[PDB]
Amino acid sequence: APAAVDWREKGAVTPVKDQGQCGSCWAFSTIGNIEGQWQVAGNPLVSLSEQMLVSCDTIDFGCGGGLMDNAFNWIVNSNGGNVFTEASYPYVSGNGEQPQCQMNGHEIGAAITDHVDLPQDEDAIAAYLAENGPLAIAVDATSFMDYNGGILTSCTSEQLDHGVLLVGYNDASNPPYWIIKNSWSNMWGEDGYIRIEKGTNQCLMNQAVSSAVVGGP
Ligand SMILES: N#CC1(NC(=O)[C@@H]2Cc3ccc(c(Cl)c3)OCCCCOc3cc(C(F)(F)F)ccc3C(=O)N2)CC1
């Protein structure tokens, strides 16, 4: 793969968002991956709706949690592949309240046809990332809680518990690192991002990487 990839420079990544007091990381990760894959496939960047998943995805558990693979499946099998825009279906669950599913009054911003699960291999993940755009991943976020900047090199890596968005990497750094977009506002980390070392499976980053497919069979 290339020595470095940063999908934020290419217009494939929306501004950092804030899940607030709701366990909706899984929906932020899903949506950020779709926003990325849609733009990289040749469409103008559009912000898409986490609220749609929180409120409408019957496989997952709203603010009680979920899985990106389940959200991808819901979008395709229950919503015809379609994803509403953020502007037309705004995120209101930051206070932890969960309105009922509203299917009316929205605009469709993107469509997906399937999803894929990547192998547990940092080089496969880098290549897929470099070709296709930002990826949904899960991490052990124990080390995220006290992060204030820099490259994490001894991240606790015991149990997955948080969904995030993998947006790039830089191999020409000592040490090499991955670039991850979090959903804890731009007041957390490096304006909402974190860097973790690449090549050492930091935070178990390789364990559950997935992506939507745009314009597939
Ligand atoms: N933000 C947030 C919260 N955490 C999560 O959403 C994590 C976010 C999360 C955590 C771990 C992850 C993934 Cl892919 C996401 O990879 C390991 C998955 C273990 C199974 O975790 C879940 C399974 C389900 C279920 F299968 F029942 F649908 C639902 C939720 C999780 C889960 O623990 N999701 C506090 C709810």
Distance of CA 146 to the CA centre of its chain: 21
Is 25 one of the annotated active-site residues of the chain?
A: yes
Q: Give the method used.
A: X-ray
Active site residue 132: no
Nearest 10 degrees: CA dihedral of 145, 150, 154, 160?
Answer: 40
Identity of the amino acid at 25: C
DSSP character for 16?
P
Token reading at 9: 């420079």
- Paired with 83 in beta bridges are 110
Distance of CA 41 to the CA centre of its chain: 17
Q: Is 65 in the pocket of ligand 1 (CB under 6 A)?
A: yes
Report the C-alpha gap between 200 and 204 in whole angstroms. 9
Residue among 28, 29, 30, 33 nearest 12 (CA):
33
- Does residue 182 carry a catalytic annotation? yes
Q: Largest Cα–Cα distance in the chain?
A: 50
Q: Which residue has the tokens 């990497």?
A: 169
The residue to which tokens 């939507």 are assigned: 212
Measure the CA–CA gap between 199 and 169, rounded to whole angstroms. Answer: 11
DSSP per residue, 67-121: -HHHHHHHHHHHSTTEEEBTTTS---GGGS--PPP--SS--EEEE--EEEE--S-
CB 52 within 8 A of CB 89: yes
Give the CB-side neighbour count of residue 61, counting CA atoms within 13 A.
6
Entry resolution in angstroms?
1.6
Q: Write out the H or E segment, with its range, that includes residue 129.
A: helix 122-132
170: helix, coil or strand? strand
Amino acid letter for position 133:
G
Give the domains, in start order, of the chain with CATH numbers. Answer: 1-217 (3.90.70.10)
* Nearest residue (CA) to ligand 1, atom 29: 66
Helix, strand and coil content of the chain, in percent to the nearest 5, comes to 25, 25, 50
Catalytic residue among 63, 132, 162, 206: 162
Ligand 1 pocket test: pick from 69, 157, 161 the residue with the most ligand atoms within 8 Å of its Cβ: 161
Provide φ and ψ at 211, rounded to 5°.
-155, 145
Q: In whole angstroms, what is the distance from residue 78 CA to residue 190 CA? A: 36
